[PDB]
């Protein structure tokens, strides 16, 4: 008679494909944190983030974190298709000590840190057509140096400017030079942004410094997948309903265990 109030305590890996977060969140796996290299091109129906997760790369920030977290979560895939942009006149594959991959200075595997090339840095203009029948998700960023000498030593430009535009939208970011508290031995930050390119629309980038260029796109779609914050371990069982407190049988008409759920779950 009374509605269900008990959970098994674990989340069943069936029938829904459950990709677990462990030390990696969806955004760190999206950017390519070295300790998240095992999540490349991996799909899911429900991605579960853990409280023990942590970042171990370059200190960054995402201004609108939630919307970018919900875009990748609803698509249910981290499929990345590399694209060759014409970064003529600049150097690529910038690395840092705060992002160690295989005990070597590295960077976000999905980002290309453009820096100076022989004390020369031209106004980069590149385009990308998007000839497909689906939306593309480009992940780019803007680097915030610590002092004016770092801004000069890396880009040889007194003021940086970055602009990412399409046929519908445009995004302009200005780097803010200043001293940040040291994080993994770095007094600098990076601001991560994104731009959706619809079919038939062209991507455009006019940057005169501090560009964290992308290496490609992700296949985005408003699918059925989602994301959930939970610490309950994943067990070997089947269960049509899933809650942050664990899997739940969907036989009773209601349930009072948590307001968040996924699947054919009776009302909370």
């Amino acid at each position: 008679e009374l509605v269900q109030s008990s959970s098994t305590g674990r989340i069943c890996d069936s029938p829904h494909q459950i990709l677990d977060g462990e030390n990696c969140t969806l955004i760190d796996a999206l950017l390519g944190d070295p300790h998240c290299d095992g999540f490349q091109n991996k799909e899911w129906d429900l991605f579960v983030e853990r409280s023990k997760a942590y970042s171990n790369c370059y200190p960054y920030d995402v201004p609108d974190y939630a919307s970018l977290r919900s875009l990748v979560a609803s698509s249910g895939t981290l499929e990345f298709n590399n694209e060759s942009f014409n970064w003529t006149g600049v150097a690529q594959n910038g690395t840092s000590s705060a992002c160690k991959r295989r005990s070597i200075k590295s960077f976000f595997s999905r980002l290309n840190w453009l820096h100076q090339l022989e004390n020369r840095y031209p106004a980069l203009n590149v385009t990308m057509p998007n000839n497909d029948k689906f939306d593309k998700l480009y992940i780019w960023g803007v680097h915030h140096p610590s002092t004016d000498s770092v801004q000069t030593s890396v880009y040889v430009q007194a003021s940086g400017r970055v602009t990412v535009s399409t046929k519908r939208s445009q995004q302009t970011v200005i780097p803010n030079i200043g001293s940040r508290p040291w994080v993994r031995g770095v007094s600098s930050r990076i601001s991560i942004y994104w731009t959706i390119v619809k079919p038939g629309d062209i991507l455009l980038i006019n940057s005169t410094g501090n560009l964290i260029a992308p290496r490609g796109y992700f296949k985005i779609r408003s699918g059925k997948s989602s994301i959930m914050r939970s610490d309950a371990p994943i067990g070997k069982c089947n269960s049509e309903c899933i809650t942050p407190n664990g899997s739940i049988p969907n036989d009773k008409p209601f349930q009072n265990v948590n307001r968040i759920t996924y699947g054919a779950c009776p009302r909370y």
Partner: antibody
Amino acid sequence: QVQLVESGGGVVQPGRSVRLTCAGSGFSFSNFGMNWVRQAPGKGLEWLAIISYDGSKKWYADSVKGRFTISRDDAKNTLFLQMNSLTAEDTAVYYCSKDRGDVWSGYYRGGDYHYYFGMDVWGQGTTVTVSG
Amino acid sequence: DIQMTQSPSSLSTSVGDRVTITCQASQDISNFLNWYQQKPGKAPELLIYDASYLQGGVPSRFSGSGSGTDFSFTISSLQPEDIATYYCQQYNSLPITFGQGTRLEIKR
């Protein structure tokens, strides 16, 4: 000149509310957060509360949570600290300090936006005395 | 809820000697640790930030070191204008907690 001047400190009866005011000039106030710290007479320094740059991130100490509420007025560049239900232990010199947190210095961990840092600019401190 | 222990509670040295006070955290806080000076009757003054760095305007005799759980604060040559009580503050996580405090006195 970067300074933080505060007022609102005085003798107040126990169980009554008090509002502390702190305003500062000489720096971009809407570009950092602020902190509150009190010091009991002869005792050490006890931390109290924090506001981020946009007022969306706030945290109260457990000895203070529920009792006090902290607010921000960027138009006047003024920091506030509401103190409700004052007991005898609240006799302390309440200081006003700076977040040392640039709006952009928000390095992400797992899910913790690590905006909280040390204090680089301090106020003078108003003496708040709770007694009957 | 991270505890900050500060030892000793007080010490006594002469002018010109090397003074070293420390600060032990109850868990790993990386380099998210700061050092302050509180002269008698005044407000705290920031001296060392991020465990290792020295704030501008502070003499070079001051310095800090450490990472993880144990940190050190060192004055290479004590001066009469250094008589104060020094605290250590973390910011690894919330809540931000201070140390007990170490008072500087004179001997002999």
